[model samples]
Target chain A: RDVRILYQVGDSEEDLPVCAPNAVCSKIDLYETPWIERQCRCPDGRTCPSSLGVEDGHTIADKTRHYKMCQPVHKLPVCKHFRDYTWTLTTAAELNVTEQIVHCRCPRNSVTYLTKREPIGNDSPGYRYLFACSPLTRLRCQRKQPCKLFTVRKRQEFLDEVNINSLCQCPKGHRCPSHHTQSGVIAGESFLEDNIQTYSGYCMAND
Target chain B: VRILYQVGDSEEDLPVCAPNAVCSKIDLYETPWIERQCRCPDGRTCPSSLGVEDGHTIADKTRHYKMCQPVHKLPVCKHFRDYTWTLTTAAELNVTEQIVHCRCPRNSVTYLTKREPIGNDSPGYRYLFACSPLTRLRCQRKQPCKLFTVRKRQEFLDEVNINSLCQCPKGHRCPSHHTQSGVIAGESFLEDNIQTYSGYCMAND
Candidate 1:
């Protein structure tokens, strides 16, 4: 049996250069840094388990898990959850849904971060409705939107906004519904409009 | 500020400590359950995006962050931000994500009201609470147990009798009795098993 204690090296660079007995680096990049090549990974020619079956010796410096990255991310059951609506809207209002609650669970070992409570209703003001969901795509989920894409004002909002929008930082993966009220303001604006007509909806899934 | 922690046993002590942290014993006479609390830890800069916004709920504006009324971060006005924001990711909780909603309803804080129909001439009372730092208050409850945020020292719990095994810092504000618990419905249930009372202290650790 393959036996090497597993760890979700979120911050690749920090958890890089070494690993456990049968450890491997993740294929996708996490650790707050991607596309930057922040870690020293082992090339395809490096070590395939069978090739690494027998090392030079039993000394500390002679172990297989050493400096550089692991060949694989040792995919584990880090993202496991079924039907837990603890965070889903406790109400029947459709537009009040957060971008993604279906993919909200984390591996029993991961943690979460937030900018605010779950996205509150549109009437709730003065704060952005975003929060962080980690262990996002320890496997596969992604997105890329302008940082300013969330600017609240209508057509003119983007004039003074930061253009980080469309950056590489996209949601890992998504599951938005075509009929969901997340796209627009539904019907509370100065002009009477429906969620589908007034407000542009949003996404929150991570693969 | 000075705060008192409740030490029930080993299991209660499990999720309480973090790396590079320490807890010490204290003799708080007011509370007999007795014992220790982790000295507050402050290695990480508290996130600026954190604090009490306009509602007991999370966001006021995905963009505009309305602060606590009167603007403050301590005691009654001490706006804390460890809850909802510090919770687990959608996957761990089994929730699915997809912009399926910049609009659709999702989970967030809302009050649970209790009332009677006035038309029937029935008596009524409001059971839910509204205010700032409510979420932060929950963070304080778990602080003594986990070193995520440090207490440094206990100041005072109230104006009257004050006591803990560890000698408190002079003039330290007392801990709040608001002992509700951590990032309720968010990240942590950071419970400390400690009993905090009215009056409070500020901990930078």
Candidate 2:
């Protein structure tokens, strides 16, 4: 019912603008000024089933070149984990506990999502760790620090330092704890390792 | 001096760059795999920063694009920026941004050790690595699929002869034999599939 095809256009004299019946058209040439519009045929000859429904077409560019495609929705699962410090008053006693829960949702047809999380030990009521339900493929799972944020520092010591906000991802039915090490930072003259810490948490299934 | 552009597959095929500059490649999605853009040399001018500190710009731009200058220091790790290539924003489409890193020549290993100064007071970045006849060597045990970053081409790895591959002491396996099958398609596909050896002495544990 769906198809995925990789197609590119322009930048070469041998490349053609003529596309297959179901292929999309695009133009963003890098070699010359008068960029010609080109539509490339699918390598596998798979066609988008437009007769069933009108497919959504999107274009992605690589500076001098561009790729166009028409395809199905991603339907990626979204697991948003939330951790908060809350207090509850019972009929006879007082209870304070860290509340944890995961909210799950799926993305729209064409939308893409990143699996990311907040800094560890962040228990604010507003802190929600969002994770795009990712396929458990070899390459994707083997990747380190899939999502991160780097802080700018004046010293060269902290140049390569980063706070990994997320590691790898998992399917909606599975869970993988994102782990990262907080690096030491320079204060005034010398560097301080006091800020160094490790934060890791799991995005568990809601069920 | 001017370096003429001559294109081929890897660093060995690249033209001789200036003393200060290194032959750098912008890793692309298309065939031929790379596009040469010599950097680290002097005289290349970047657009002056127009007061904006950190934001994707319509003009003189973001923290990433701000690297129009040469890599201040070296022995740095070559890694990708945090941008997803599949999704391109309208603002980013017009500018000639860097997809690869402001790094040293590719295939050089980044050894994170003590921080020393490269420039005045500015500490040096990670240490770069190379294989030597005595200092750094590798040897494979079961199969001959191991790869090495030789002095010839520091940008990519190649399969070397068995004797030239290593000089182990007594009963040691080739130092670093971490191999990931090169079949999976991705940005680092070539480097990954090359089966590059790390050249570090290993212990059986």
Candidate 3:
């Protein structure tokens, strides 16, 4: 219950990795040092990943300077399931409703356009694609090869072809595709149009 | 006035805000005088205010407290139905919330929240919700005296827009009536009108 606050670490090398009792060193895995350098970013207790390293016995209940949300994790939106809505009502609240439409929107100021719509293959009448929103630059590659759009590194494993609206890029250390931007036709409809003129090509690494 | 049993609490407290978030004083309680509220900086937002926890009374030596268990859905108190709920758009809202209505349960009181639409904003409703005990007395022939206080002062300090725990005042008879006010302890004595509510009992002026 002391006055909990974060302070700078000492000048010594040993002190640099030192975190609060409820924190873990951000850079625990020294193997990938070339790509991501280690830091003293100590996330809240017990919340830190074993891969990133954590202090023993530190928990969410502790009061410490290392209190924080874990890094690089975006929160998913909350959904109001049928039960959550109907629980408060007096009647049995019975409904034969099968599907619910919680109109989903991408985060504001994210991708400039809806761009493409690839339908999901289903056993029945059909479903929609899981649209993801991020910086448009990260989702496309330049036509002619040699890492035109950065190193043409592999996209995050989380995004898939069925859901991804943007063109896929070549994996790291692989041969670049010769095709330019593989774009959908510029449809006339206002809402479902692809306004961005991105060239599609899986470019090779500039290395 | 009843000679209340005087007890003292310590000042061992901790800063509740996360890193990079701004902490400001919330003028909600009189005893603490000033309380703190942590707001996420700029574009980033914290988690939703939907999370709730069970609340228990402080140090129950005797079995005289009604431990009101936490419910899955947010409760709607009887009196707060027609109240105006406002939200400040300047702060970074924790989530993209929409207007949702609620109803009071049978034979119980809850802090009611009614969403009012202003525009097409993500958090489109002006918002505030609190469910507390009510007390009525023979002031101007008695009125519903609501307790306006924070149940979890520490949590209110740590985060934003949390629901207050709902429980009746201890050591008093706040019977379930339309008036909502139980009989005062010294009702017969006009000089000493004694009623006890936690935090503070605020009746209409």
Candidate 4:
């Protein structure tokens, strides 16, 4: 049969007085670094039932059973239904500035923010707001022709003033641009006209 | 148990086949639109399950079930370092303004404005290819003065302003003015006040 015995270390400055007839005295400093290493030994005929330290022959097992405790591991629950949205002014300047808008949809109820290094850029500033899903919102017009025309005009004005050699920086170019540079001359103007014609049939008279 | 029944346009076969047998089929062609009702299994009064003789009736079954699943925690937004600065023109005349400037034990630098603000609300634009610890200035005055100061200061020192300047009591370190050149030493003063009156002395290389 296994015998379970509890032990305790005394707070007294002096060594504990010997009590067990077969026990031997040994000096043990509980305040030392890694102080739990000390252990008590019983006589050869009788083994120490508990692994506890003895200062002067007897173990304080009975006195320390109430203080023995274990620490619990903390577990965090998974959360869902969270969402977030962020916008940023990539570049702001008086002379022609081009900005990139980022729209992100996450789970319904989580917290999020756009950092400088989030594929946005190392120096880009971020604007963040909580996530909400009600009616779907779009930054660009749903009509392709109108959106393209607006993008072309905005880019042309910016390029004319800032001498921008590329048209892909326009707003509609967020995903793909309809025109490419030919002989180093950007076809942004012609692309805008073509897009308007393509979408003309779908354009509403009231719109 | 098994039973056989037959139907035809006339009732002559029913009586001729078996007189004592029960008639399994009921004909309602002569009594069409007659009121008839029945009760359902739940003991509630309901209409008969049969439809009109020419029409047809069908039954369908649908099953639905739901279960609770573990939700996942969403990732959080990571933070990164970035900075921005805004400057406005103080004068209508074309003049170079030092947006920001700084000098310390390690290095000295200045950012000069090449293009001035055009309209009253137009933003004066400038760009730096890379990030570096250099002083910026925005001066609109052609000539500098002792007290010609910029309205904003948070653009450079994060939050602290020129008030953090070494302004000791009248005689203690007394803040005397001196002129220094070679490396453009008074860049901070030039950034704060776009005039030429105030100068900072540089004693070492």
lDDT by residue (tens digit), candidate 2, B97-178: 1232234332222211121223454332222222212223334444232233211112111212111234444554443222
Q: Can you write out model 4's per-residue Cα lDDT over B14-39, one digit (the tens) per residue?
A: 22211111112121111111111111
Better of 1 and 4 by lDDT: 1
Model 3 global lDDT (CA atoms, 0 to 1): 0.25
Query: Judged by TM-score relative to the true structure, which candidate is superior, 1 or 4?
Result: 1
How displaced is residue A127 in candidate 3, in Å? 4.1
In angstroms, give how far residue A184 of model 3 lies from its true place: 21
Q: Alpha carbon lDDT of residue A83, candidate 4?
A: 27
Best by lDDT: 2
List runs of model 4 lying over 4 Å from the truth.
Answer: A1-207, B1-115, B119-205
**Compared with the true structure, what per-residue lDDT tens digits does model 2 show for residues A75-135?**
2124333212111111111212112122233222111122333433334332223333322
Clashing pairs in 2: A73-A109, B116-B124, B182-B193
Candidate 2: stretches off by over 4 Å: A1-19, A22-207, B1-116, B119-170, B175-199, B202-205
Give Cα distance to truth, residue A35, candidate 3, Å. 37
- Ranked by lDDT, the better of candidates 1 and 2 is 2
Would you estimate the TM-scores of all the predictions?
0.16, 0.24, 0.18, 0.12
> For candidate 4, lDDT tens digit of each residue in A70-127?
1110121222332233323233223122232223322222222221222333554532
- Between prediction 1 and prediction 3, the one with superior TM-score is 3
Residue A89, candidate 4: Cα error in Å is: 44
Q: Which runs in model 3 stand beyond 4 Å of their true positions?
A: A1-117, A120-130, A134-207, B1-50, B55-76, B79-81, B84-205
Q: What digit string (tens of lDDT, one per residue) describes model 1 on residues A48-144?
A: 2322111322101100012112333222222344222212211224332212222233333222222132334566532222222233232322332
